């Protein structure tokens, strides 16, 4: 049941960049998005195997109000693109879509362990996934990549602009008091204020969103099982 | 264990105002809030000791329809900020959050015995807790602070604008006929009409909302036990 490379999927960097520039026009930035603490919120993450050209994706759906897990699914796929910085999403999108499709319920708001508009072409994983699914998505990353930012306030909740050159592409958000911030960016159909609100609601106990913690653990386990 | 002052909690009035000026912009005013009589509603209140620099917070969750108590939690903490009018919330927020975190269920709607937008800087306890938790909140106060208002009608349910200069920051609400009014203000993710509707729902017999009566009694008992 391995997810194969989609028929006609980009095979060159020129084609991939062309897809990004074309699909970016479908991104919605002025829709505030759903509020935190209600409905469903889903984490997505992937694990790449080092021995075979396979990638495993996991989607974990949480009840936003309680943060309890209500559903989960994984998918195994063929890596669909060579390793090229700036086009990394082309390696895993097909498999991520498969994991989401395997869920027994809608994901609600999708939280990716990565970036959305905070990308060289303003079309990272979260934005790419958002436009293809038509669903609200955001990205929360552990490191700032090559972006810059002023240290946000020390208290949890504090934020600061995350910049690509001089342009704001997200926010450094303090999820835990006095602890290193995470980097939040909009993906699709969610604004920055709401992206931050969801990230804080997913981090009452840890620095990393529970959606990422859950999805990370699950795809790693599924990858181990797939290679066994 | 005693809730200590957060790793990066404000230490100066300048830092405190910085937090307020940053989070105030994230307060939500265009949402109606949960329908009264549905789900759960939570009261929060604190008790300060005169001899020891400690504050005790209590969170009591009620069934919105019946007003029956369904959950309770308390927390004892170090006063996290010196006494400075306009920044009083910085002394108790960490402890209040600890109490909320210890609850076995989502709060639903947080009703504070204090103020929300009706604050000398438009960011009182209710609004601050709202932005930090992402939850809907309102403030219900026993006195009008320094705000002006005309006596509301005599019958229960009667209301009148609570003004800060010329701007409405809440409403003087008659919760009981022949009894002085209380002062309701939006905290976060709730509108004034709903804040008042919830306040009337919480006052079928007494002047003070049952959420406050419950939380007040609980933090007071917890404080006595803590300093015993
Ligand atoms: O509902 C699960 C999370 C809650 C903790 C229990 O009320 C929380 C309370 O403010 C949010 O509703 C965050 O600690
Ligand atoms: Cl990329
Ligand atoms: Mg990962
Ligand atoms: Mg991972
Ligand atoms: Mg009180
Ligand atoms: Mg009291």
From Swiss-Prot, chains A, B:
CDD domains: Endonuclease_V. Mg(2+) binds at residues 45, 113. Its EC number is 3.1.21.7. One of its GO terms (biological process) is DNA repair. It is an enzyme of class 3 (hydrolase). Transmembrane segments: none annotated. Its cofactor is Mg(2+). It is found in: Cytoplasm. The keyword Hydrolase applies. Keywords: Cytoplasm, DNA damage, DNA repair, Endonuclease, Hydrolase, Magnesium, Metal-binding, Nuclease. It catalyses: Endonucleolytic cleavage at apurinic or apyrimidinic sites to products with a 5'-phosphate. GO terms for molecular function: deoxyribonuclease V activity; magnesium ion binding; RNA endonuclease activity, producing 5'-phosphomonoesters; single-stranded RNA binding. InterPro entries: Endonuclease-V. DNA repair enzyme involved in the repair of deaminated bases. Selectively cleaves double-stranded DNA at the second phosphodiester bond 3' to a deoxyinosine leaving behind the intact lesion on the nicked DNA. Belongs to the endonuclease V family. This is Endonuclease V. The lineage of its organism: Bacteria, Bacillati, Actinomycetota, Actinomycetes, Kitasatosporales. The gene is nfi.
